[PDB]
Amino acid sequence: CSVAGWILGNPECELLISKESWSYIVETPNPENGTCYPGYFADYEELREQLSSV
């Protein structure tokens, strides 16, 4: 899952919907399960910065 996948929810990221707390977030080098319905994610990079303090 990409960060976009995790937050928007993604049919294949279902295993993440139950995890509410963490110490850090680990993303793989080339995530595939992101925005499954193609489109522009506005201010994506900015959201990643906001979620880095959560």
């Binding site: 994506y44 990079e45 990643r48 910065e49 880095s52």
Partner: protein
């Protein structure tokens, strides 16, 4: 040596868009510049202290 080299620096990176290359390059410049400076300071401090330490003991 231990007391001076106190790290409060955050190196977690940032993503940039295809139209934010100037910002990406500024961020890269800042991280590389700080790294070059601290590498310089760490190596120089150790070499100068090793030389003074040996003179001290002699």
């Amino acid at each position: 040596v231990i007391e001076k080299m106190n790290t409060q620096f955050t190196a977690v990176g940032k993503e940039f868009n295809k139209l934010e290359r100037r910002m990406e390059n500024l961020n890269k410049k800042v991280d590389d510049g700080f790294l070059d400076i601290w590498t310089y300071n760490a190596e120089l401090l150790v070499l100068l202290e090793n030389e003074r330490t040996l003179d001290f003991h002699d």
